[PDB]
Design a protein around this ligand. Structure first.
Ligand SMILES: [Mg+2]
Ligand SMILES: [Mg+2]
Ligand SMILES: [Mg+2]
Ligand SMILES: [Mg+2]
Ligand SMILES: [Mg+2]
Ligand SMILES: [Mg+2]
Ligand SMILES: [Mg+2]
Ligand SMILES: [Mg+2]
Ligand SMILES: [Mg+2]
Ligand SMILES: [Mg+2]
Ligand SMILES: [Mg+2]
Ligand SMILES: [Mg+2]
Ligand SMILES: [Mg+2]
Ligand SMILES: [Mg+2]
Ligand SMILES: [Mg+2]
Ligand SMILES: [Mg+2]
Ligand SMILES: [Mg+2]
Ligand SMILES: [Mg+2]
Ligand SMILES: [Mg+2]
Ligand SMILES: [Mg+2]
Ligand SMILES: [Mg+2]
Ligand SMILES: [Mg+2]
Ligand SMILES: [Mg+2]
Ligand SMILES: [Mg+2]
Ligand SMILES: [Mg+2]
Ligand SMILES: [Mg+2]
Ligand SMILES: [Mg+2]
Ligand SMILES: [Mg+2]
Ligand SMILES: [Mg+2]
Ligand SMILES: [Mg+2]
Ligand SMILES: [Mg+2]
Ligand SMILES: [Mg+2]
Ligand SMILES: [Mg+2]
Ligand SMILES: [Mg+2]
Ligand SMILES: [Mg+2]
Ligand SMILES: [Mg+2]
Ligand SMILES: [Mg+2]
Ligand SMILES: [Mg+2]
Ligand SMILES: [Mg+2]
Ligand SMILES: [Mg+2]
Ligand SMILES: [Mg+2]
Ligand SMILES: [Mg+2]
Ligand SMILES: [Mg+2]
Ligand SMILES: [Mg+2]
Ligand SMILES: [Mg+2]
Ligand SMILES: [Mg+2]
Ligand SMILES: [Mg+2]
Ligand SMILES: [Mg+2]
Ligand SMILES: [Mg+2]
Lengths: 64, 144, 117, 201
RNA sequence: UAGCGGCGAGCGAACGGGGAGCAGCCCAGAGCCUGAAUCAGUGUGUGUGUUAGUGGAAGCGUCUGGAAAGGCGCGCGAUACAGGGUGACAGCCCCGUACACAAAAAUGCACAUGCUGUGAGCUCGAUGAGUAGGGCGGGACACGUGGUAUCCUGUCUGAAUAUGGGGGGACCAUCCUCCAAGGCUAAAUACUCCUGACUGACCGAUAGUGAACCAGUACCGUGAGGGAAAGGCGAAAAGAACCCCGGCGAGGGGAGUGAAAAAGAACCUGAAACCGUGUACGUACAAGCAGUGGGAGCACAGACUGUGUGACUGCGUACCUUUUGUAUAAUGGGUCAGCGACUUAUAUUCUGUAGCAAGGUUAACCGAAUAGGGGAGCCGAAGGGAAACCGAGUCUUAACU
RNA sequence: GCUUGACUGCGAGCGUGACGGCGCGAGCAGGUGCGAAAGCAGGUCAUAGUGAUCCGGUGGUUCUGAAUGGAAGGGCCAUC
């Protein structure tokens, strides 16, 4: 039967123009006041999935 | 051309791996699974995104955003699709009849993609700046 | 598509057994053993084609040594003399000559001695 | 494209695409193979160790008896046990793209014309429904193994054919690539050829 | 997909579209006109099945052979060359097949018709109360109580009643849509203990059913229950009269049958393990994976080389598995024969290959059926953004060098 | 002594990690502090002082809002 998607992965990843995946950075969720503003700013924008974990993401998201 | 003279193209059919048929085969005793582990086992292996136990990437990283229901009912049209309709008026109904947009599509946009040669009248559709310019150049008309 | 495998299996076994004719006991009667024996024989044969070359050279050298000494010269000295004299006769031939033609061998030895000194 | 007729010795114009294209062997082969696969029926089944009739109790205790460890009497490695990968009934029908099928037909038709195995005639009717008459007509036409393709459906012709195993009468709608390749010669009526051209385009 | 979900593992719609099939009615009720349509049972007539059946074409000569259906000649039938038998492979020898016919009787399904019950249409009405909601506890909806709509109810309550009420995914207003608390209803859908016909890139006696055979038997178990093994003489018994050895044996040798009995019922073929008889060569001073390289002699077969044996001699510690590493005194195998393990379906990606190409392809289904229709859909030709939205750009930011 | 640069948006380019990430960073825009000015300041001589995701809480919002207008809920930003 149809392959099922890993719904968590679906929530966390979105495919881009060539077939990458952007994702939201970790560590910008709670205790923030100790984190430096520069660090927070850098974490804020989205980020492409690296070469190492691309395969795993692909496995997770067969219909992405 | 008889039923015993036809033959496939070279490279069309390839040999099907048969595991575990002796030494010369190549895929001998073990069948390309190495020596006794979990992956070696029949039914063996670990589910998608399993990292030995490490919090897997699809969990490490935070969830984000929401899904728009209006996006499911929006659509994007091409100037080649402005020519693919019949007549000289591009409504939603006309586009749907043409089979360009989907049936449950309340909204559509004409984007500068491809090119429009014939004059067309885009009625009740959003049109991008490039597309509007292109249609006007073609000799078209846009109205709300 | 039930491919029954009697005929092929027996033919294969028979070929191995035939190859293992003349072996003591189950090594000529019982397939498992016969096959093991056949493989072993093959391995030995490969080894022994090499060893055959080695052995025959050894034999030739022994014979030549005996002959040369009978004509009053050691083998090593005789070979050196021949090399010096530019005689390219290989030692299979030298051994044969020694065994079957004493006059010829003696002549060769004389040549070697002269060349040596 | 132009096929001269046997009976009137008059030409008949046809499409170069349909009757004068190249022979794409790979495509034709795929289509014929597909036809064969479709024709097969595929009704069989063995019993898995699940389905083999017997109890599911352990033949002997795991340890102690010294025998090798057995779990079910229905094991595939046991005599009268299940077939390891027991078959089920399966559908061997391959899909063939419409265009691919049409192209194959076109190639076969072209090959026939080139090889002089397609014989076109104005009409191939028999007067009575009599095998003897059909046989005589075929002999007169020199033919023995033949696919008679007709435009309009003929009762006398079909009945006459029925008992000649080398002969087969078809309607132009029901031609098939394996049949065309198989039959030594193919005798098309003028209406039939025209219809085929219309069908194939 | 949207959603649900220790937001894990997993579960997973609906709206809308294409098809198959399409049938609508009745009571909460009385006045009128009233046997009025429909439905059910029951007789009768007709048609068409079903349960026995009838007819059903056309070939001989010759050779081989135990036997012709085979070879080689010359003919004939075919709306019949499906299939099965007959001394080897038969269109024409037999049974059938195509095709054309057949029912005293019983009965299925159609109409036609008679009888019985059944009640149509109009006007006026009436419009399902411990119910809908609610509180508490559970359950069902893709929906795990969550912001949770909707459905069911164990418990405690409890309306309005068309000037009315339900729903539109917390909730309110507006708008739209429908009328709960009473019923009936064919088709398209599911299945095969069983009956008939036909088919198979299904098996062919360790296979296929457990069971080709007197099998759910023998046997095992107190019992529920478990559960085998075991097919083949020959074309035809022509199954061996008679004689002989032997215990009025078993078994055998003649005889006879037969094409063949080394086809004799312990019966087609008749492998291997295993066990013998005969012949050649070797072997009783010689130490080990038993072979291999060299190699004398001896025997045989042909006119020296083939074959068989192998004195003596160099080298040489099986195989598998598992291991850093095994001759290992680590595992497994007494041997032989048969069987015994990377499959199948559906999704997805990449590679090859074929088709068409800014297009490609159809799914159910329909179909004088692998044709043709069917483009509902799906993938692609546009991306960016969480989204609104913008768009060859877009997002970020007040703005970007 | 005077102050709040213990700024906001970004950031060429590097370092270090299998990755999650972590680190250094001139310069640009806005707005400030000290200095006469050149200048310096995006915490502390540097290297420890820490905890992913989920699920919620609080505030803001030119996003969304299941007939429509709202609202709930969701998103985004800050934070617990
Ligand atoms: Mg936050
Ligand atoms: Mg290999
Ligand atoms: Mg290998
Ligand atoms: Mg492998
Ligand atoms: Mg192993
Ligand atoms: Mg290991
Ligand atoms: Mg491994
Ligand atoms: Mg398993
Ligand atoms: Mg469409
Ligand atoms: Mg039990
Ligand atoms: Mg079985
Ligand atoms: Mg089709
Ligand atoms: Mg009869
Ligand atoms: Mg007959
Ligand atoms: Mg004959
Ligand atoms: Mg015979
Ligand atoms: Mg009511
Ligand atoms: Mg209630
Ligand atoms: Mg409620
Ligand atoms: Mg309700
Ligand atoms: Mg609402
Ligand atoms: Mg057998
Ligand atoms: Mg059995
Ligand atoms: Mg049995
Ligand atoms: Mg007695
Ligand atoms: Mg007797
Ligand atoms: Mg026999
Ligand atoms: Mg026998
Ligand atoms: Mg034997
Ligand atoms: Mg001795
Ligand atoms: Mg000893
Ligand atoms: Mg010899
Ligand atoms: Mg030796
Ligand atoms: Mg190893
Ligand atoms: Mg060890
Ligand atoms: Mg060793
Ligand atoms: Mg051992
Ligand atoms: Mg082992
Ligand atoms: Mg053992
Ligand atoms: Mg694949
Ligand atoms: Mg491909
Ligand atoms: Mg100043
Ligand atoms: Mg410090
Ligand atoms: Mg979690
Ligand atoms: Mg939770
Ligand atoms: Mg909030
Ligand atoms: Mg709004
Ligand atoms: Mg709304
Ligand atoms: Mg809100």
């Amino acid at each position: 039967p149809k392959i099922k998607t890993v719904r968590g992965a679906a929530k966390r990843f979105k495919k881009t123009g060539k077939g990458g995946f952007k994702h939201k950075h970790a560590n910008l969720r709670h205790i923030l006041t100790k984190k430096a503003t520069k660090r927070k700013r850098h974490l804020r924008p989205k980020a492409m999935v690296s070469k190492g974990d691309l395969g795993l993401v692909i496995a997770c998201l067969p219909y992405a | 051309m008889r039923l015993n003279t036809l033959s496939p193209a070279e490279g069309s059919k390839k040999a099907g791996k048969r595991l575990g048929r002796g030494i010369g085969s190549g895929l001998g005793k073990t069948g390309g699974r190495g020596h006794k582990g979990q992956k070696s086992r029949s039914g063996g292996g670990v589910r998608r995104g399993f990292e030995g136990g490490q919090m897997p990437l699809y969990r490490r990283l935070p969830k984000f955003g929401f899904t728009s229901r209006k996006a499911a009912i929006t659509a994007e049209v091409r100037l080649s699709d402005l020519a693919k309709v019949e007549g000289g008026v591009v409504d939603l109904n006309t586009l749907k009849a043409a089979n360009i947009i989907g049936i449950q599509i309340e909204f559509a946009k004409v984007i500068l993609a491809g090119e429009v040669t014939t004059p067309v009248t885009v009625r009740g559709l959003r049109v991008t700046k490039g597309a509007r310019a292109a249609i006007e150049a073609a000799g078209g008309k846009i109205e709300e | 598509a039930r491919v029954k495998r009697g005929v092929i299996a027996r033919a294969r076994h028979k070929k191995i057994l035939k190859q293992a004719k003349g072996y003591y006991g189950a090594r000529s009667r019982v397939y498992r053993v016969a096959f093991q024996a056949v493989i072993k024989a093959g391995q030995y044969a490969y080894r022994d084609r090499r060893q055959r070359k080695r052995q025959f050279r050894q034999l030739w050298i022994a014979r030549i040594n005996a002959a040369a000494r009978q004509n009053g010269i050691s083998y090593s000295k005789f070979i050196n003399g021949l090399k010096k004299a530019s005689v390219e006769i290989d030692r299979k031939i030298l051994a044969d000559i020694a065994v079957f033609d004493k006059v010829a061998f003696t002549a060769l030895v004389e040549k070697a001695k002269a060349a040596l000194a | 494209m132009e096929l001269v007729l046997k009976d009137a010795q008059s030409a008949l114009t046809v499409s170069e695409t349909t009757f004068g294209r190249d022979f794409n062997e790979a495509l034709v082969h795929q289509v014929v193979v597909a036809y064969a696969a479709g024709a097969r029926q595929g009704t069989r089944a063995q019993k898995t160790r699940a389905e083999v009739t017997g109890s599911g109790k352990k033949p002997w205790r795991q340890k102690g008896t010294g025998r090798a460890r057995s779990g079910s009497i229905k094991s595939p490695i046991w005599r009268s046990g299940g077939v390891t990968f027991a078959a089920r009934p399966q559908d061997h029908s391959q899909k063939v793209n419409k265009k691919m099928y049409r192209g194959a037909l076109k190639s076969i038709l072209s090959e026939l014309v080139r090889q002089d195995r397609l014989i076109v005639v104005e009409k191939f009717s028999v007067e009575a429904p009599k095998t003897k008459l059909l046989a005589q007509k075929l002999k007169d036409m020199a033919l023995e193994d033949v696919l008679i393709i007709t435009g309009e459906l003929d009762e006398n012709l079909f009945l006459a054919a029925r008992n000649l195993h080398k002969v087969d009468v078809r309607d132009a709608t029901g031609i098939d690539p394996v049949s065309l390749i198989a039959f030594d010669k193919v005798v098309m009526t003028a209406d039939a050829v025209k219809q085929v051209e219309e069908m194939l385009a």
